[PDB]
Design a protein around this ligand. Structure first.
Ligand SMILES: O=C(CCCCCCC(O)(O)C(F)(F)F)Nc1ccccc1
Ligand SMILES: O=C(CCCCCCC(O)(O)C(F)(F)F)Nc1ccccc1
Ligand SMILES: O=C(CCCCCCC(O)(O)C(F)(F)F)Nc1ccccc1
Ligand SMILES: O=C(CCCCCCC(O)(O)C(F)(F)F)Nc1ccccc1
Ligand SMILES: [K+]
Ligand SMILES: [K+]
Ligand SMILES: [K+]
Ligand SMILES: [K+]
Ligand SMILES: [K+]
Ligand SMILES: [K+]
Ligand SMILES: [K+]
Ligand SMILES: [K+]
Ligand SMILES: [Zn+2]
Ligand SMILES: [Zn+2]
Ligand SMILES: [Zn+2]
Ligand SMILES: [Zn+2]
Lengths: 376, 370, 376, 370
């Protein structure tokens, strides 16, 4: 069976912003919550860890921590003045580092650790210490720009990890598949003119950043054709994502021949997430993980890293994350998803499924993707 | 300007079930929440009340409470043994009254008060004490069957209120528009063979009850044509609802000529709700309220009652409920919805809007409302 | 029966600091709480309001709000630069205004409203609009110094209200009885050399400010003898407070002849409070209120204002506040205190009670207080 | 340095009662909390575990779990019908198992695991697998009687562990020092006529059970002199506990010559606990642990087990528990207690300290320990 490293540090669960109601800063007409604060709360990630423990999964993984990201690692993406400004605000008790990017006291150090876990997870897999890895990187990364925090992200975790991996191991082709329900704009921007990183984002059309679809943004010059956005219709579920995987993602990976696959794995496409309108269940995440693991085994010697991004349902994210880790490790626990059958009944009807399928067929043709089968 | 009665009692906010993570009972693989609890929490409804107070709107409403529903009122819909079972479980510290219907200690008395508020709101509007009314009825009602609690509902609040109103005032034609995002199966069942109550449900296709669409279920015998289900595609927002209102709801109300309109107003079609996948903002609820108020003014002498049902976003339901009450009262507060512009950017694209519009055109033709 | 004004505004319940675990700022070794934030949370005060509503008490009171305190009112106590600094920090999302004085976004406006309620409550009682009043003033006031926020207090609410009342009504003798369990250092400092305000603090010896007892601090020069501190031994309950009232407070009021009595009413001497070690129950607060109401009826034409200060037990403060309001209004609700009998059993034993009684006898003699009986 | 086993299972943190405001059942005049819940919450114990992890201390301990307590182990203390009643109530979604003993869904299995951890911790220390041990046993045990749950305790964890240890290893003299701030009435009752177990309770005079002091209850017949209660005055802190340890506890342990010391370690004597009125800081718990470890080294070959009982300050219990584990292990982390200096300033004054000291001198003389 497979050796799966689980990169985790309890301190990542200690990052916390000032009072928010969901994503709204408290103040003006927004009353402070009586309990549940900012949507990016420790509790989703903590409940995943707890379920991994009680299920017996954690005992079957290689549990690892890592040193925090060095200034050197961070400076490959971010300027010194960004680091200074972030640290100053963190030392002064927190506040607003960007639009939709609130920080708390000591968040700077915790963000460095989150980035460090992602760096170390790529390193372990490239070094052959594990077949694959899951990094519980909080705070998340995939919206962060080099000089602009956004969407709850303060460092560009995956980009920092990739640039570190290139410096240490000399990997030439990395694919980043971002199935967080929101657009991976940070990864897209950083690698937009680069052909050494294929960035693919599956996202709800127009969700975040708001109004962005992006199908026509395929990269430029050297990077032309090495960025793919799949703007799925709000309301879609299992079939929409499976069709996207089969018609766009897998053909794109086949042409690119990645030596390493990184997944920006948010769980906010789940059917009860407040921050998007998609209808995935735990078995959808399982199936996506199975597909990308297979692609990694065919092109990249099994080298796959999954980095935790979003997911805002305290109740349901634990089941979705568990499914991914079971699939990475090849270990099936006794956990049974209590919402699975219910979510199956809520799925788009045949007319809606056909409508989305036709759009994905059109998009695959627009990308110039050939419907080949998996081989090698 | 209009006189809007606001039926509220603080005790309705004291109803609470045992530990749940969202809708999942704690136990087995479901870890107890560190804070949260059950999705049907007091906090959504409390935060609406708080925002009404801080906005100053409460000062422009006619604030009212009401006695709890009498056994007589409850027994028009529910059997004595249902009342007994419910009370016994409530006295024993709570537990499971139905499928997805958990109760807490004393929930029985609080459910009677919730029903009482709905009864009193209809009565006030029919008596001419107010032009219209909003009832903050928690726990909710629109899924409850005569002998079966479901979907967090323990009495059929709107049905109890209607049967009480018919007994006291003799109203002949009532329309119930249910814009809670889930199917109003309780109201549908009770009035399914009746032509004195037109029941219309806008809901996300297949959301709750799970897998139910219902477009072909138009009522039977005497009630044939007096039930309309509009199963909207998941992911739809403002335009989907505006098209449903213009092509189906308003024409249906025009044909029926209601003497009273009741709205089963859940806010769970809002764009950040965990329990559905729709994309409404506060101005969508404002516009729906404006449309139904206009229909009430045309047919029912302005007689409109809005009864609070679902809505599970603590942050956003208050803004949506506020918009409804502003529209009922004709008073605009200083409150500005902080998510409005953001939600407008997230709406379905033109292709998706066209797809849904065509389905609504087809459905309107099915219903004979071209 | 009596006419009791209840000064309340829902917006006072919207003040909220950044993440704290009890009184500890989150950061370093202090993990963010999963639910319950700073000890000075809205929930204690909100649960009091809720219980007043469901009990039917609120319907028997004169429910009033008030305009926020003007700059003019605030400037009688606080400097312009303090107001500027406070507002700037409030507009920038909150943070630390002093030691143990954290603020949130918009806290400046809410603090002005809290001060406004206290101003208006004194005004109503002096104007004859009500016999007495209760002001649910959050955030609290009694630790705040003219140029230093402290102990969760940002304006000196009672002092601001008194200076406003002197300017508007020309009241000559005001007594402030502070039964919040912590020392009323703000009120003490402001009035320390003044004989127009008698400040009395009952407090747990050394609790907050930490290590302060203060029995020998009786005021200076013109104010000598017009400040009295009663440092009660930690662990004391009903008898300790009754003895303090009878041997010190009532004799001190009798000599002073107040024209108005203000109570700085914290409920944090209750038997389950985390922020002190005293053993009061709801009937202790009832009895203290009865004693001070009687003193107000004898000297001040019934003019009594109770201003809410501390109290950190979400479960129990509502019962204690309810008892005070019942006693002010002369209306007894159906509410029965579920902890009353239990707390009675926990009281100090006879030896401990005798030990504290003897100290209070000694302190009364040290203050030069004659054991006279109530008259007039 | 010392080998310290840390017995923990994540599932112990999943036990949860129905809605309570602190210790008050929700219902009647007690409003449901918006967040909080019952005082015996997972969060205190979870935050201790989290701080042990972030401090790096967990990496220097021998991390262990254990099987749940078998029926055989439980039945040495509790009757079969007690087990049956408890399980039935647990399977039915929870409720009230005793006076101040509420349970939740599945609490039965979780209580068995809590007891199992205590059993295994004693076993490991007696087997020489570790020099000493800390068991994070939730739910707690020290109030539980053989046939009566009380004070949030459902099995008599320490007693079950001791009777199991006597059956397996044949230990003849065990001392149980209970520094939870409340009276260890369960342990006291079970061992009241026994001289093979010395039970000592330090507690706030009259706290819980309410009104109980107990200085004169020294055991009976064969057990006369093998139970000692030290009812400390409410408001006491560091000096009161240090004087109790030096004048009563250590002399009592010297006379008894324990072959094993078990500590019922609640942290609810801490200075910010809602459920008592005492003024300890983390260094008080450190010092108590140092003193009892030294006694264990002198008489019991170092064999010391600390079993977690109470402690209701989410913010402060983690620092107190950390100090105990540092002292057991001989490892000092980088953690600095942020309340330590503040709590030192709040301590009883000299007159009050002298008053309590004199009472302890008198009590030591009563016990014949001058
Ligand atoms: O902007 C937002 C939503 C932010 C959503 C970020 C998603 C983050 C993420 O899950 O992908 C991940 F990065 F965490 F992974 N709300 C508003 C807008 C305007 C005003 C208030 C609130
Ligand atoms: O119970 C649900 C969904 C219940 C949704 C009820 C909606 C109620 C309502 O808003 O319309 C109103 F009535 F409140 F208004 N899911 C589960 C639970 C357990 C297991 C699987 C799925
Ligand atoms: O200083 C404190 C406790 C503050 C207590 C203020 C009491 C406020 C009050 O109730 O009287 C009233 F004003 F609210 F009414 N804790 C520490 C110390 C150091 C480090 C962290 C925490
Ligand atoms: O129940 C209580 C106090 C219970 C205290 C139990 C302490 C348990 C413990 O810490 O020692 C340990 F066992 F957990 F360790 N009060 C009420 C409740 C209802 C009505 C009145 C008073
Ligand atoms: K994405
Ligand atoms: K690229
Ligand atoms: K509906
Ligand atoms: K009908
Ligand atoms: K005081
Ligand atoms: K003075
Ligand atoms: K004890
Ligand atoms: K004994
Ligand atoms: Zn996301
Ligand atoms: Zn609903
Ligand atoms: Zn205080
Ligand atoms: Zn205890």
């Amino acid at each position: 069976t497979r050796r799966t490293a689980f990169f985790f540090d309890e301190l990542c669960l200690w990052h916390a912003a000032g009072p928010h109601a969901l994503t709204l800063p408290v103040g003006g007409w927004v009353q402070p919550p009586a309990a549940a604060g900012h949507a990016e709360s420790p509790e989703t990630k903590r409940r995943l860890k707890s379920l991994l423990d009680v299920s017996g999964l954690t005992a079957r993984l290689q549990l690892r921590s890592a040193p925090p990201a060095s200034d050197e690692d961070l400076l490959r993406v971010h300027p010194a003045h960004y680091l200074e400004r972030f640290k100053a605000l963190s030392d002064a008790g927190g506040g607003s580092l960007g639009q939709d990017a609130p920080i708390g006291p000591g968040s700077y150090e915790i963000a460095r650790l989150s980035a460090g876990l992602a760096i170390a997870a790529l390193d372990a897999v490239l070094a052959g210490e594990a077949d694959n890895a899951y990094s519980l990187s909080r705070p998340p990364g995939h919206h962060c720009l080099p000089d602009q925090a956004m969407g709850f992200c303060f460092f560009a975790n995956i980009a920092v990890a990739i640039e570190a991996a290139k410096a240490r191991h000399g990997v030439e082709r990395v694919a980043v598949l971002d199935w967080d329900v929101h657009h991976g704009n940070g990864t897209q921007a950083i690698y937009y003119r680069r052909d050494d990183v294929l960035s693919i984002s599956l996202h709800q059309d127009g969700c975040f950043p708001p109004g962005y679809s992006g199908a026509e943004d395929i990269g430029e010059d050297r990077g032309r054709g090495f960025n793919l956005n799949v703007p799925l219709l709000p309301g879609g579920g299992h079939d929409a994502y499976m069709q996207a995987m089969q018609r766009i993602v897998l053909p794109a990976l086949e042409r690119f021949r990645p030596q390493l696959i990184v997944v920006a794995s948010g769980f906010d496409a789940n059917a009860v997430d407040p921050l998007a309108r998609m209808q995935l269940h735990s078995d959808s995440f399982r199936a996506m993980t199975a597909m990308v693991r297979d692609a990694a085994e065919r092109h990249a010697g099994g080298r796959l890293v999954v980095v935790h991004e979003g997911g805002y349902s305290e109740a349901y994210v634990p089941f979705c994350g568990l499914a991914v880790i079971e699939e990475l490790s090849g270990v099936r626990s006794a956990v049974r998803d209590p919402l699975r059958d219910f979510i199956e009944l809520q799925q788009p009807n045949a007319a809606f499924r056909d409508f989305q399928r036709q759009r994905l067929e059109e998009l695959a043709a627009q990308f110039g993707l050939c419907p080949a089968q998996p081989l090698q």
